[PDB]
Amino acid sequence: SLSTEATAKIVSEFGRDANDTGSTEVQVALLTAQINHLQGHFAEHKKDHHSRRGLLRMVSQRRKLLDYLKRKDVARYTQLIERLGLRR
Amino acid sequence: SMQDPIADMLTRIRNGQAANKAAVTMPSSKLKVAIANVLKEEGFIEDFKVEGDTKPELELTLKYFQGKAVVESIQRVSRPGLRIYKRKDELPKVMAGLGIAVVSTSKGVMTDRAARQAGLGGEIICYVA
Amino acid sequence: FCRFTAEGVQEIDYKDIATLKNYITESGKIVPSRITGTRAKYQRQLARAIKRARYLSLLPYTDRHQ
């Protein structure tokens, strides 16, 4: 998983409240951090299909959050992707 | 997931009548409620009561005559996978009319015979018998 | 009537030999969950602790070996 303190950080940066924890942008970036962390493991271990499944689940949940965010509001979407450096 | 609450209501009524439950309860809705109005108005039920502010809870009180249930049968006719609209001239009869068929029309919800009298068709929600 | 449950121990110590010894066969097997009277949850901890001690030679695997 992700370290708790890492989550607390990501929250501080992206949550408008730092107690909210449920902001779409927040959840996006949490997923993003987790994907980033998991990239190295799967680079090393190319055959752990099992966990690779949950990884992909994270990716999808991220994408869906992004779709929701796109429709709801575009400026927020754009800044978020900028911050995360996500291509789309 | 829940796809039709009208269906859920009819099933719950069916099962309460089946099980000899005095009353039955479920989430409340406007259409649900006007249906309960109707059924009372046609004396298949003793009374309904909606309760709650936020997610209010409708409660029908069932009816038993000489022991056996009073809604002999209740069955939906329209449904989300297949809706059922009729013209006034096309209004069925339930049980050769010994029953009723709930219908929505532009002038609210009401049984088939009241609709005939009014002179206007609509959506046949369900037969009751 | 599980001793670990009324004593209320949190965990079972492989280091504590003799309380284990209470639960072992003169041959060194582990005595039967369904026939012993120790609760299941504590039971598995007991088996784990026995195994550990065995590895450490504190306990024998069996009576015979040497």
Partner: protein, 259 residues
Amino acid sequence: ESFAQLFEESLKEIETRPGSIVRGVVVAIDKDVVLVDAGLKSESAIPAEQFKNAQGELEIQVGDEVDVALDAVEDGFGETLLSREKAKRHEAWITLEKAYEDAETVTGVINGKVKGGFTVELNGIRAFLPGSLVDVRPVRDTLHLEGKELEFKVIKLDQKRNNVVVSRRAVIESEDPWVAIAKRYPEGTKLTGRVTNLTDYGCFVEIEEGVEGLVHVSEMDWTNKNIHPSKVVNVGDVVEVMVLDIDEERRRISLGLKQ
């Protein structure tokens, strides 16, 4: 009304689960079945052998009141665990009474040790005690007139498993089972144990504080195979048994009865 609700909690208040409240009136006697009614769902099928006192004949006619026991309820139609155990609690209370003044006095008469402690019998029941308890010193009641009259002064009791060794003569003088299973061990320590259920291969006498003994079918008597243990001993009765074998590991203490 709430008359009935209040009456229910009232009737809860005026009964308890064990054989404590002497309530069942004997409402039919026939050999060999007594029957009471202690305010339970059904009447007990009582044996006659929980009610004859010390020489074999009955003591209680119609209307008489003994409590029985409980905590076991209905496989179909019937009620209670026998009232004789009831009696055990009374015996326990008298034994406990000692603690108050540090001396329980009755009569104890102990001729010999089945397993290292003279046997003492109080009223109807007879109990077994560890070897020291019978005599205060090294006096030994073997030279005393047989089955002599003293009292019992307590030497030792095991507090969980019920073994009590008591003090004859000398009036002037005044987890848990199978951790240290070496007390009744050494080869042949005789015990007094009530049998529980006879499983057509066995008899299951088991008394000494949460253990299990068998006395299976081979000994039981001095005939081997044609015996059928239900014919030969009893149901629910305290008998002659000793260990012959303990495995403290696969908790099978294998007692015997041919001794």
